[PDB]
Amino acid sequence: TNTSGSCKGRCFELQEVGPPDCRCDNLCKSYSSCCHDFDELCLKTARGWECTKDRCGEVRNEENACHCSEDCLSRGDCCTNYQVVCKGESHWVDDDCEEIKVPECPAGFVRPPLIIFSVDGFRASYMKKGSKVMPNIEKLRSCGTHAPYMRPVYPTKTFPNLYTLATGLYPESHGIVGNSMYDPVFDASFHLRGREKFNHRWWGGQPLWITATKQGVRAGTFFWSVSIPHERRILTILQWLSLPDNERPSVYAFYSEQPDFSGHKYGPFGPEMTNPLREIDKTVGQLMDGLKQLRLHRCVNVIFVGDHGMEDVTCDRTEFLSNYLTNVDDITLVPGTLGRIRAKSINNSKYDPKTIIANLTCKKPDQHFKPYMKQHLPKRLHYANNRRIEDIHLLVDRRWHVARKPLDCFFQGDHGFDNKVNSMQTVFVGYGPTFKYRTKVPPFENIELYNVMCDLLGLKPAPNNGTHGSLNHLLRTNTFRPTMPDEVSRPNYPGIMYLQSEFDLGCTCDDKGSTEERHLLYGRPAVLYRTSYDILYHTDFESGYSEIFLMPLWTSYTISKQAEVSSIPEHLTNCVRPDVRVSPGFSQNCLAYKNDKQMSYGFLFPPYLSSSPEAKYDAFLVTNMVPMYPAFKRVWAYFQRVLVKKYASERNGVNVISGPIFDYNYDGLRDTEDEIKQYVEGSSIPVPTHYYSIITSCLDFTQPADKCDGPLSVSSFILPHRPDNDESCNSSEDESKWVEELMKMHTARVRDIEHLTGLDFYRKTSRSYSEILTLKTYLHTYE
Ligand SMILES: *[C@@H]1O[C@H](CO)[C@@H](O[C@@H]2O[C@H](CO)[C@@H](O[C@@H]3O[C@H](CO[C@H]4O[C@H](CO[C@H]5O[C@H](CO)[C@@H](O)[C@H](O)[C@@H]5O[C@H]5O[C@H](CO)[C@@H](O)[C@H](O)[C@@H]5O)[C@@H](O)[C@H](O[C@H]5O[C@H](CO)[C@@H](O)[C@H](O)[C@@H]5O[C@H]5O[C@H](CO)[C@@H](O)[C@H](O)[C@@H]5O)[C@@H]4O)[C@@H](O)[C@H](O[C@H]4O[C@H](CO)[C@@H](O)[C@H](O)[C@@H]4O)[C@@H]3O)[C@H](O)[C@H]2NC(C)=O)[C@H](O)[C@H]1NC(C)=O
Ligand SMILES: O=C(CCN1CCc2nc(NC3Cc4ccccc4C3)ncc2C1)c1ccc2[nH]c(=O)oc2c1
Ligand SMILES: *[C@@H]1O[C@H](CO)[C@@H](O)[C@H](O)[C@H]1NC(C)=O
Numbered sequence: 159t160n161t162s163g164s165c166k167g168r169c170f171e172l173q174e175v176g177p178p179d180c181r182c183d184n185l186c187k188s189y190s191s192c193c194h195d196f197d198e199l200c201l202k203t204a205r206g207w208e209c210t211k212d213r214c215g216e217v218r219n220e221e222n223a224c225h226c227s228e229d230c231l232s233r234g235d236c237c238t239n240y241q242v243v244c245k246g247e248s249h250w251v252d253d254d255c256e257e258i259k260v261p262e263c264p265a266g267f268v269r270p271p272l273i274i275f276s277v278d279g280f281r282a283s284y285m286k287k288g289s290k291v292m293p294n295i296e297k298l299r300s301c302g303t304h305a306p307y308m309r310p311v312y313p314t315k316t317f318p319n320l321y322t323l324a325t326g327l328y329p330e331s332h333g334i335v336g337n338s339m340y341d342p343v344f345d346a347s348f349h350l351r352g353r354e355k356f357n358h359r360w361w362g363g364q365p366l367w368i369t370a371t372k373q374g375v376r377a378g379t380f381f382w383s384v385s386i387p388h389e390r391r392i393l394t395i396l397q398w399l400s401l402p403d404n405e406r407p408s409v410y411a412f413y414s415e416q417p418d419f420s421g422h423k424y425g426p427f428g429p430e431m432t433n434p435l436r437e438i439d440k441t442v443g444q445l446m447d448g449l450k451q452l453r454l455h456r457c458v459n460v461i462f463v464g465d466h467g468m469e470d471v472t473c474d475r476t477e478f479l480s481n482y483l484t485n486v487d488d489i490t491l492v493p494g495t496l497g498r499i500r501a502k503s504i505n506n507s508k509y510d511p512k513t514i515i516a517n518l519t520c521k522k523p524d525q526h527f528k529p530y531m532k533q534h535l536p537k538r539l540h541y542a543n544n545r546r547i548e549d550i551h552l553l554v555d556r557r558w559h560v561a562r563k564p565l566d567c568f569f570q571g572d573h574g575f576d577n578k579v580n581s582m583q584t585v586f587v588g589y590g591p592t593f594k595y596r597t598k599v600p601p602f603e604n605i606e607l608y609n610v611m612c613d614l615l616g617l618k619p620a621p622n623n624g625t626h627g628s629l630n631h632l633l634r635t636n637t638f639r640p641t642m643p644d645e646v647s648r649p650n651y652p653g654i655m656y657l658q659s660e661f662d663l664g665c666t667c668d669d670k671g672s673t674e675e676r677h678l679l680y681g682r683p684a685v686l687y688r689t690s691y692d693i694l695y696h697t698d699f700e701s702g703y704s705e706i707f708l709m710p711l712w713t714s715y716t717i718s719k720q721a722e723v724s725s726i727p728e729h730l731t732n733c734v735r736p737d738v739r740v741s742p743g744f745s746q747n748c749l750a751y752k753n754d755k756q757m758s759y760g761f762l763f764p765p766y767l768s769s770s771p772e773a774k775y776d777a778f779l780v781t782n783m784v785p786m787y788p789a790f791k792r793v794w795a796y797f798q799r800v801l802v803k804k805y806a807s808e809r810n811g812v813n814v815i816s817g818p819i820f821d822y823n824y825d826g827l828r829d830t831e832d833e834i835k836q837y838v839e840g841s842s843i844p845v846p847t848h849y850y851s852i853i854t855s856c857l858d859f860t861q862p863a864d865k866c867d868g869p870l871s872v873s874s875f876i877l878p879h880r881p882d883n884d885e886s887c888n889s890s891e892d893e894s895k896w897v898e899e900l901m902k903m904h905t906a907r908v909r910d911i912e913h914l915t916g917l918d919f920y921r922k923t924s925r926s927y928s929e930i931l932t933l934k935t936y937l938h939t940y941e
């Protein structure tokens with residue numbers, strides 16, 4: 159740690175130097191390792207950041223922050239407005255938009271460089287609301303490629319989101335699950351303020367700068383020390399862009415603490431917010447004028463991106479656990495816009511998580527939070543598979559805070575809430591030679607950007623949570639060619655092979671060709687793991703029956719706009735019929751359900767939607783049967799009897815694909831038969847942790863679902879298979895007052911269902927695979 163070395167000719171060097179030698183890079187301040195003369199040499203401030211008429215053609219002075227001398231361009235250190243003030247040029251923002259059909263790079267450049275310009279707490283609505291005070295940002299947005307909004311990851315905090323942007327991973331996977339964290343294995347705490355965050359043990363996955371370097375692409379610095387002014391960060395980027403071909407980095411990142419810092423104090427739309435926005439825009443202008451005078455403004459790819467949004471949150475809107483709990487001083491709480499509950503460590507043997515959950519469950523009529531055990535949280539949040547995530551979680555309502563007691567105004571804004579909340583949405587703008595011209599694209603999740611950034615730099619992305627090819631429609635060229643995954647298990651197509659007399663399933667029933675075309679509209683789902691399964695055809699539906707799980711992996715059926723809804727006849731209530739195509743040994747039995755005093759059963763294809771009374775008997779086949787708790791049957795029967803027809807009538811028919819999910823380890827991935835921890839009493843019948851449905855129809859609703867030309871439209875859910883309805887505070891009332899609300903909370907992407915089942919959907923369509931990938935990543939928000 160020898161500080162006696164100098165920074166002379168080493169200011170913001172890109173080669174990192176280890177001990178004893180002192181550092182002259184931007185992170186040297188954060189690690190307290192700079193050479194004695196770092197601030198003096200590298201952080202000059204004299205005469206400001208702008209050229210004036212009088213300074214034009216000046217004699218070079220070492221003391222100045224930036225220069226207005228004739229040699230500054232070749233030295234790559236002019237003030238960004240040099241050519242405008244001195245050489246009579248115009249500001250980039252004043253020029254009309256001209257399409258960049260090919261990169262116009264100076265000789266020597268291997269590829270167009272990438273500049274990631276990141277802004278903290280920049281909410282999606284600032285683009286429209288602040289447009290008049292942001293002309294540079296408006297030019298980038300209007301003449302490049304932009305999304306109306308970009309969805310952040312949960313929690314909608316800085317560190318989990320910036321690290322998701324860099325890696326393409328969910329927080330539960332990269333390890334930065336919050337701004338404040340406690341790892342029980344390390345017995346250490348990660349905080350916004352402190353030296354523990356600098357330890358590399360916390361940061362999982364492979365960020366973009368490591369992906370680049372490992373593939374021989376030079377990466378500039380992503381993390382900047384707070385003491386480095388935004389003008390110096392911009393000039394450092396421009397100076398690095400002026401380096402010789404063999405030293406010049408290809409990927410750069412700028413970061414602005416604003417508008418977040420002001421947002422917390424003044425709220426998202428506080429009158430004080432106009433100045434920070436004008437400032438961010440001025441910084442954009444400086445970068446753009448700086449690139450123009452270096453002849454790079456039609457060669458560099460620029461990404462203007464945010465990490466999260468900002469909501470109106472005051473301390474008057476605070477919910478206290480001391481109003482629900484007796485032992486509030488005997489618990490540790492990560493408070494605010496989310497809640498994570500832990501017991502206090504010493505002499506607290508009476509701590510019961512079940513008592514804390516019960517006392518936080520539907521207690522006040524207007525309660526502004528909901529408790530959950532992390533494995534019961536909506537699957538779309540991907541917030542469970544990490545030891546740094548406490549078992550007790552509190553999902554707090556937008557505009558609300560959670561605190562322990564009145565003991566614990568200053569703030570008018572905050573963020574961290576569910577990532578589907580409007581105020582939490584952020585921005586995406588792509589501008590440059592590889593992005594499209596004057597193009598608007600649909601909203602997407604920030605997990606997807608890492609693959610795009612690799613593509614823009616010709617890199618091979620590390621394994622991540624993005625779906626490579628889903629964002630090809632953003633690019634003019636340098637597109638990745640995606641290929642469908644190969645089917646691992648081929649299906650069996652059984653015929654009639656068994657006699658009714660062979661079946662002693664303890665089941666009783668008073669029961670004395672054009673299917674694939676109508677009910678399987680996008681081909682059969684591909685099974686991407688090793689297993690034994692049968693395709694079963696029926697008049698009203700088709701299924702893929704698992705011999706190992708003794709139930710369908712999937713059930714596919716089309717419900718037209720005009721379909722008639724019938725009831726289950728009184729004499730068929732407890733009817734279960736054997737399927738003469740499937741062996742009694744590969745079949746479920748009624749005796750297991752009679753002997754399970756907590757478990758009942760349901761059907762994947764709804765008997766309520768049968769085409770005829772004759773066809774209705776197929777719905778009662780033992781092979782359409784699935785285990786269901788009585789409480790869950792209330793949810794499932796309402797969905798099947800009421801909601802499927804409602805959707806068919808609203809969407810001009812629907813195609814439904816339903817089935818079970820097994821995720822006992824809550825990792826978001828399909829369980830192997832050895833991971834199943836619950837079976838129907840004294841049986842091989844596994845209990846699903848969740849039930850899914852994929853509801854597809856035509857984007858052009860004037861076309862019926864079964865005769866659709868053009869893009870598709872989808873909505874999906876992953877319902878938790880619970881023995882009670884404590885999640886729904888009005889569950890004592892009629893299902894029409896609570897079931898649909900539950901389902902909206904548990905909305906999912908087709909891609910989320912694919913990970914959990916090992917299935918591959920939409921294999922036989924008239925659409926391009928890139929378009930199908932975009933469809934699979936779609937989340938229906940009801941927001
Ligand atoms: C989102 O996308 C994710 C990424 O694809 C998915 O997560 C992956 O899930 C799988 C399955 O669960 C898991 O695979 C297992 O890996 C076990 C070994 O794990 C360690 O190594 C990997 C790989 O390390 C490489 O990459 C990193 C950079 O990412 C690099 O730093 C390493 O040096 C190493 O480099 C090599 O590869 C890179 C390219 O990636 C090259 O550039 C390089 O040259 C080298 O070739 C790590 O990623 C793991 O990291 C976890 O653990 C550390 C320490 O705890 C954390 O810091 C980190 O955040 C991460 O934690 C998360 O995952 C673990 C589980 O791994 C959770 O428990 C935790 O809660 C977090 O969520 C490890 O350090 C291996 O043992 C295992 O083997 C099993 O299967 C084989 C069959 O193949 C059997 O034979 C065995 O018996 C085992 O049963 C299996 O292969 C991945 O590790 C995991 N990756 C990550 C990043 O989490 C995720 O599922 C997906 N989400 C959804 C919902 O789809
Ligand atoms: O801790 C802080 C402020 C300190 N920041 C943290 C993030 C950071 N990122 C970068 N580089 C980016 C560029 C980039 C681009 C792509 C991918 C990764 C990255 C990394 N450089 C410096 C800093 C310093 C904080 C801020 C807001 C808060 N809001 C709140 O509620 O708490 C808050 C705490
Ligand atoms: C839960 O509520 C009951 C009744 O108000 C109370 O007796 C009990 O102490 C509470 N438990 C906790 C842990 O807050």
Ligand SMILES: [Cl-]
Nearest residue numbers: 336337338492
């Ligand atoms: Cl946090």
Ligand SMILES: [Zn+2]
Nearest residue numbers: 278279316418
């Ligand atoms: Zn932030």
Ligand SMILES: [Zn+2]
Nearest residue numbers: 279418419422
């Ligand atoms: Zn913040």
Ligand SMILES: [Zn+2]
Nearest residue numbers: 821827828829
């Ligand atoms: Zn699993």
